[PDB]
Design an enzyme around this catalytic site. Structure first.
Site, short mmCIF file in Angstrom:
data_model
loop_
_atom_site.label_atom_id
_atom_site.label_comp_id
_atom_site.label_asym_id
_atom_site.label_seq_id
_atom_site.Cartn_x
_atom_site.Cartn_y
_atom_site.Cartn_z
N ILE A 85 0.93 -1.25 -0.35
CA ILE A 85 -0.18 0.21 0.53
C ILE A 85 0.42 1.89 0.08
CG2 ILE A 85 -1.57 1.51 0.92
CD1 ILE A 85 -2.40 -1.32 2.51
N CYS A 86 0.56 2.63 -1.01
CA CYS A 86 1.12 3.73 -1.27
C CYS A 86 0.17 4.34 0.11
CB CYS A 86 1.48 3.82 -2.31
SG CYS A 86 2.76 5.39 -2.17
N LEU A 87 0.65 4.80 0.84
CA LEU A 87 0.51 6.55 1.24
C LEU A 87 1.15 7.16 2.92
#
Lengths: 145, 376, 76
Positions: A85-87
């Site tokens: 996940i990219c955040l």
């Protein structure tokens, strides 16, 4: 040697006061791992799906961020083929992370800085990308119990 | 007219994006080559290594820094000399319910520039011995508990004594004994001061730091934007138009493309200023987070912008400055940019002109990298 | 000492800095001269991103070095 106070007490509050719409419970064998289930938000391209995530509390938690990965395959600009996940503020916690992941599903349209292939398709051919997310939802996030 | 100014800059930014600065495409390509030469893999097919970096480059997409977007708008509406004068004037803190900005908007063509600060108070602490403490290399924006002193090391690496006695510090230091909590956070909701001496000392230190931080300048600028407030034939239909980009989210082109300038215009002047003033005076993060989202998210993300990990936990302060806009100067600057684009990047439509500018920028970047990393 | 901060548009900014100065202090000096909030700045030196909690010294940045001020964030 055993779990720090912070994880013991935070796990207890997480079980006593769960995030609405999110299942999260520690693994029975290693309490640093959590099994998470998030429902596809209604009105999103992920409606009908349920998405399983693994969340891991590193030895440095909360001074370092939890590690998180979708175990369910999902077509989303912020999620790659590995389910990564990219955040990180150590004032935050598991429920904060879960809330942000849920919001990603509610508003999947890519932020401008994203440059990966799914983000570009969602940016340039949004109607096609949404249809693809719905197909993957039906293929991978349903009949998935 | 002022409304024509608004329509023209919106139309041009929408159509042309980064080309609005009137920079030759070869300049961007050459400067991007300078920035990115260290990104090119050193082994393997160097020609292919160069092509990968050029493909991944985004030198012809617009800035998403809010400050650069504001500089672009100021330069266009005011001219270079006018923008330089605007920058010289001082910011004023927005009052509690925004009255000072309200009383600074006569019925003329006006440009507002806003700088918003966040209060970036320390959330971490660690124990350290005086002989170990090196402020140059120590983690910054952080509380250090020494055996005889309590200090705050700010984001600039300056040490700030927090006025505690040696006796107080010695007790607090020796009360925090678990290895896990030698380096930790303040204000952790999961400690129970009545359960241990360590948890009580951690809570007590946090109360000391909180009182001292009330009188320490922890402000750092987090967002920037501009508001165009055009002249109105009647003061009852006087509207305003916020313009912004946002670092983690969107460009000014996307702001205009989603018509968020028009959506926020529907609030009216008093309605918008009242939301902006509440953002700077509220002490509730749930109120702060919603208004931040309503005002500064890209269109369609108002309800998720400041949720979860992006909840707005820190106090904010809104600062503004106002100057008049000469529409003839603004329109002349926008027309000169249009002439520059039509002269150097001619095309049947805006999309063709943008693609021509991009191909030229990629070619300049490619030529410079191949010149420097290969032999012809 | 003096360092140069160069932008994509060809602007060059000259800064008076100490080797001990933090990256955040450099971004506040850029804010003072260009009006860009430090939160919406990225700094690059010889291919490497400069992280806010670090110092110029952590990257062996000496006198008359050139940094690049990147004003388009990309990541992922």
């Amino acid at each position: 040697a055993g779990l720090p106070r912070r994880i013991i007490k935070e796990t207890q509050r997480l079980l006593a006061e769960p995030v609405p719409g999110i299942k999260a419970e520690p693994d029975e064998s290693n309490a640093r791992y959590f099994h998470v289930v998030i429902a596809g938000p209604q009105d999103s391209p992920f409606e009908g799906g349920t998405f399983k995530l693994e969340l891991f509390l590193p030895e440095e938690y909360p001074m370092a961020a939890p590690k998180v990965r979708f175990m369910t395959k999902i077509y989303h600009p912020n999620v790659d083929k590995l389910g990564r996940i990219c955040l990180w503020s150590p004032a935050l916690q598991i429920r904060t992370v879960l809330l942000s992941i849920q919001a990603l599903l509610s508003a999947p349209n890519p932020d401008d800085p994203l440059a990966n292939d799914v983000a570009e398709q969602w940016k340039t051919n949004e109607a096609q990308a949404i249809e693809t997310a719905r197909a993957w939802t039906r293929l991978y996030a349903m009949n998935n119990i | 007219t002022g409304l024509h100014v608004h329509e023209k800059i919106k139309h041009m930014v929408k159509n042309y994006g980064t080309m609005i600065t009137g920079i030759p495409a070869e300049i961007l390509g050459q400067n991007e080559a300078e920035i990115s030469v260290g990104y090119v893999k050193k082994m393997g097919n160097m020609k292919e290594n160069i092509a990968e970096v050029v493909r991944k480059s985004e030198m012809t997409q617009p800035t998403n820094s809010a400050g650069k977007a504001s500089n672009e708008v100021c330069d266009l509406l005011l001219g270079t000399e006018g923008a330089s004068e605007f920058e010289k004037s001082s910011y004023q803190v927005l009052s509690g319910d925004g009255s000072n900005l309200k009383g600074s908007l006569p019925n003329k063509n006006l440009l507002v520039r806003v700088e918003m600060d966040r209060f970036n108070a320390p959330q971490k602490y660690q124990k350290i011995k005086r002989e170990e403490f090196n402020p140059e290399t120590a983690e910054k924006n952080k509380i250090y508990l020494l055996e005889d002193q309590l200090v705050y090391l700010d984001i600039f690496g300056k040490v700030i004594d927090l006025g505690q006695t040696s006796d107080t510090c010695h007790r607090l230091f020796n009360a925090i004994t678990t290895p896990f909590y030698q380096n930790y956070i303040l204000y952790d909701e999961y400690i129970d001061p009545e359960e241990s001496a360590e948890e009580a000392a951690m809570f007590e230190m946090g109360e000391i730091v909180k009182a001292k931080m009330k009188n320490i300048d922890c402000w750092t600028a987090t967002h920037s934007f501009t508001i165009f407030v055009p002249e109105s034939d009647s003061e009852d239909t006087r509207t305003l138009y916020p313009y912004q980009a946002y670092w983690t989210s969107h460009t000014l082109q996307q702001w205009f493309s989603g018509d968020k300038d028009e959506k926020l215009s529907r609030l009216g002047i008093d309605g918008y200023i009242e939301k902006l003033a509440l953002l700077g005076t509220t002490t509730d993060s749930k109120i702060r987070s919603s208004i931040y989202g309503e005002l500064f998210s890209p269109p369609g993300k108002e309800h998720v912008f400041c949720t979860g990990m992006n909840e707005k936990f820190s106090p904010l302060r809104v600062k503004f400055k106002v100057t008049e806009v000469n529409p003839e100067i603004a329109l002349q600057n926008l027309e000169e940019v249009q002439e520059f684009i039509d002269t150097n990047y001619p095309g049947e439509n805006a999309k063709d002109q943008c693609e021509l500018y991009k191909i030229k920028a990629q070619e300049a970047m490619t030529k410079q990298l191949e010149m420097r990393l290969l032999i012809e | 000492m003096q360092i140069f901060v160069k932008t994509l548009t060809g602007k060059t900014i000259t800064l008076e800095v100490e080797p001990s100065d933090t990256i955040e202090n450099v971004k506040a000096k850029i804010q003072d001269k260009e009006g860009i909030p430090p939160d919406q700045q990225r700094l690059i030196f010889a291919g490497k991103q400069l992280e806010d909690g670090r110092t110029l010294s952590d990257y062996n940045i000496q006198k008359e070095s050139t940094l690049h001020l990147v004003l388009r964030l990309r990541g992922c």
